[PDB]
Amino acid sequence: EVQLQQSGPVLVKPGASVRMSCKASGYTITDYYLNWVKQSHGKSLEWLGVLNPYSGGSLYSQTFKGKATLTVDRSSSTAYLELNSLTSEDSAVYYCARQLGRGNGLDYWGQGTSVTVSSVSTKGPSVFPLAPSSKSTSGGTAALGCLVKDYFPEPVTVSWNSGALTSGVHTFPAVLQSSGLYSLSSVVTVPSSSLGTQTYICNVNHKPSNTKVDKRVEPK
Amino acid sequence: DFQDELDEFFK
Amino acid sequence: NIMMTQSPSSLAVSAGEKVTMSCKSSQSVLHSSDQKNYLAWYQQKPGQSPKLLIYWASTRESGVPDRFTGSGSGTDFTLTISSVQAEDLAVYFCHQYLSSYTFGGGTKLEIKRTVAAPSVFIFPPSDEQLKSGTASVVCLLNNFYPREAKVQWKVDNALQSGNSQESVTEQDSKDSTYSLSSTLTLSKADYEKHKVYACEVTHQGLSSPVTKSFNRGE
């Protein structure tokens, strides 16, 4: 199937530059143009420009002329966006999105790369179990979870059982603590009857701090 | 103009 | 540039209802060489990337359900969803690509459903966290509707203030509910001064507040 795999989240300081990547697979990268679009919050999209992967030339929005630079490496079928002179206003998710030709819509979008521009240094989270107990049971069901506390910047990703457990999961939006660090929780509801035979592990990734934690969550 | 830039770029 | 304006900012409907949303461009988006309006619509579900629904103002992208239809001309465009499904909750964006590409601000489509009271759970701090000097107590409100809910933390029946934070999820794409997590954070020293840790929950589906609690160290 078609895929556009973008590189992971990054934290960068004001004034620095950043380069991110977008790898095309399941199709030949030459057959489609590649756009880059910023999403600063959920109700905002802004176009940066478009790359012709065949030639390697680009056309830029006037807003991003001299701020963004698009390139391509065809041997690895990978496109790149470099942003320079970064300010706090450049923090956003950046999407790559393919376009067949002039009259087409942006028919497939990558998963986005989150860039945070900040003077604050990275901090990795502590991961603590939220253990099921008699006060986290509701009629044959038990809730359990992980608390991912004190990190910077966003995002933290959480999976359960390496992605084998998705039903009944709620991974909450992070809260910003007064310290300027984030905290989030991720919970799941499961049968109380099988707490002794099933294993529940939350897999927490925080790329900017190199945190990769697997925490087993057992009844207290 | 920009519309024409896009026409040329996508040719 | 060409400015795109969407209305309304958000709307909420029950599954099965028809919805219309508006996209207005500041000038024509008609491309003369092919006589197409270079106008696209995208659907962006929570936590996902945008998906292309419509291009040329009215042509449905392959795989897009028939219930999504784009219409309009000149500067006035419309997206109609003929029979809204629970999974259609999303922000819908319009996009002109005649000139330097610009997007509308989005219409957020939310789903209405029957009242559902939360299932409430409380979690003491982990022993691992306690060893480090801090105690976080978590109250979970699962799968409720509507989204308004209130949590009050009580410590041996004393109402707490200033020491908790909460957040609510996006709406669920299958059952149209929300969930909420609240964390009460105390120093370990303060945590061990008290016995009963309670979260008291008020919500439309409850006729009286529900309290879930534990006794510390038991």
What are the sequence ranges of the domains in chain A?
3-117, 126-215
B3, B8, B9: best mutation site toward chain C, by most C Cβ within 10 Å?
B3
Longest dimension (CA), chain B: 15
* CATH no. for A3-117: 2.60.40.10
Distance from CA of C82 to the nearest CA of A (A): 22
B2 touches chain C (CB under 8 A): yes
Task: Give the SS3 label for residue B7.
Answer: helix
Distance CA C214, CA C199 (A): 9
**Do residues A99 and A107 make contact, with C-beta atoms less than 8 angstroms apart?**
yes
Beta strands (DSSP E) in chain A are 3-6, 10-12, 18-25, 33-39, 46-51, 58-60, 68-73, 78-83, 92-99, 108-109, 113-117, 126-130, 137-138, 141-151, 157-160, 169-171, 175-176, 182-191, 201-206, 211-216
Q: Does B4 touch chain C (CB under 8 A)?
A: no
- CB count within 10 Å of CB C144 equals 24
For residues C43 and C64, what is the distance between their CA atoms, to the nearest angstrom? 10
Is B6–C33 a contact, with Cβ atoms under 8 angstroms apart?
no
- Contact yes or no for A186/A170 (Cβ under 8 A): yes
- Of all residues in chain B, the one with the smallest CA distance to A104 is B10
How would you label A115-135 residue by residue, b for 16+ Cβ within 10 Å and e otherwise? bbbbeeebbbbbbbbbbbbeb
DSSP letter string, A12-69: E-TT--EEEEEEEESS-GGGSEEEEEEESSTT--EEEEEE-TTT--EEE-TTTTTTEE
- Which class does domain A126-215 fall in? mainly beta
| Stated length of chain B | 11
Residues of chain A with C-beta less than 8 angstroms from the C-beta of C166: 175
Runs of H (alpha helix) within chain C: 127-130, 188-191
Residues of chain A positioned with their CB less than 8 A from the CB of C170: 173
- Which residue of chain C is at minimal alpha-carbon distance from A41? C105
Q: Are A135 and A144 in contact (CB under 8 A)?
A: no
Answer whether A204's CB lies under 8 Å from A158's CB: yes
Which residue type, as a one-letter code, is found at position A80? Y
Binary contact (C36, A45; C-beta < 8 A): no
Residues 6+ apart with CB under 8 A from B4: none
Strands C10-14 and C107-112: parallel
Partners of A138 on chain C (C-beta within 8 Å) are 119-121, 142
Radius of gyration of chain B (CA): 5
Domain spans in chain C, listed from the N-terminal domain onward: 4-112, 116-215
Listed by number, the residues of chain B in 1-11 with a beta carbon closer than 8 Å to a beta carbon of chain A are 2, 5-7, 9-10
Q: Backbone breaks in chain C (C–N > 2.5 Å) follow which residues? A: none
The answer to whether the beta carbons of residues C107 and A42 sit under 8 Å apart is no
Residue A70 to residue A87: CA distance in whole angstroms: 19
Contact A35, A50 (CB under 8 A): yes
Burial class of residue A70 in the structure, from the number of CB atoms within 10 Å of its CB (0-12 exposed, 13-18 middle, 19+ buried): buried
**Do C52 and A35 lie within an 8 Å CB cutoff?**
no
Structure-token match 């001299």, residue found: A66
**Amino acid, res. C177:** T
H-helix or E-strand spanning residue B4: helix B2-10
Give the separation between CA C18 and CA C83, rounded to whole angstroms. 5
Resolution in A for the shown PDB structure?
Answer: 1.4
Q: Are A35 and A97 in contact (CB under 8 A)?
A: yes
For residues A46 and A120, is the Cβ–Cβ distance under 8 A?
A: no
Distance CA(A84)–CA(A91), nearest Å, equals 12
Fold of C4-112: Immunoglobulin-like (2.60.40)
Closest CB to A189 among C100, C138, C142:
C142
Structural element, H or E, at residue B2: helix B2-10
Nearest residue of A to residue B6, measured between CA atoms: A102
Cis peptide before C46 (omega within 30 of 0): no
CB contact under 8 A, A59 and B7: no
Residue in this structure with the two tokens 């830029």, named with its chain if needed: A60
List CB contacts of A141: < 8 A, sequence separation 6 or more. Answer: A189, A190, A191, A192, C119
Name the residue of chain C whose CA is nearest to A113's CA: C49
Q: Kindly list the residues from chain B whose CB atom is less than 8 angstroms away from the CB atom of residue C99.
A: 1-3, 6
Look at strands C164-168 and C119-123 and give their pairing. unpaired
Contacts of C103 in chain A (CB under 8 A): 37, 44-47
Neighboring chains of B (3 or more beta-carbon pairs < 8 A): A, C
Fold category of C116-215 in CATH: Immunoglobulin-like (2.60.40)
Whether the CB of A33 is below 8 Å from some CB of chain B: the reply is: yes
Angle at the Cα of A149 from the Cα atoms of C159 and C172, rounded to 5 degrees: 80
Question: Angle at the Cα of C68 (from C71 to C59), degrees rounded to 5?
Answer: 50
Indicate yes or no: CB of C100 within 8 angstroms of CB of B2: yes
Interface residues of chain C, partner chain B, Cβ below 8 Å: 1, 31, 33, 97-100
C125 Cβ neighbours under 8 A, 6+ residues apart: A128, C134, C135, C136, C137, C191
Q: What are phi and psi of C177, to 5 degrees?
A: -100, 175
- Bridge-based pairing of strands A78-83 and A33-39 is unpaired
**Quick one: closest CA in A to B2, which residue?**
A61
Which residues in chain A have their CB less than 8 angstroms from residue C102's CB?
47
Partners of residue A62 in chain B, C-beta under 8 Å: 2
For residues A34 and A96, the answer to whether their CB atoms sit within 8 Å is yes
At C80, which helix (H) or strand (E)? Answer: strand C76-81
> Which experiment gave this structure?
X-ray
The minimal CB distance from B7 to the residues A33, A50, A102 is found for: A102
Q: Closest-CA residue in chain A for C41?
A: A105
Q: How many CB atoms lie within 10 A of CB C130?
A: 16
**The tokens 């219309």 sit on which residue?**
C20
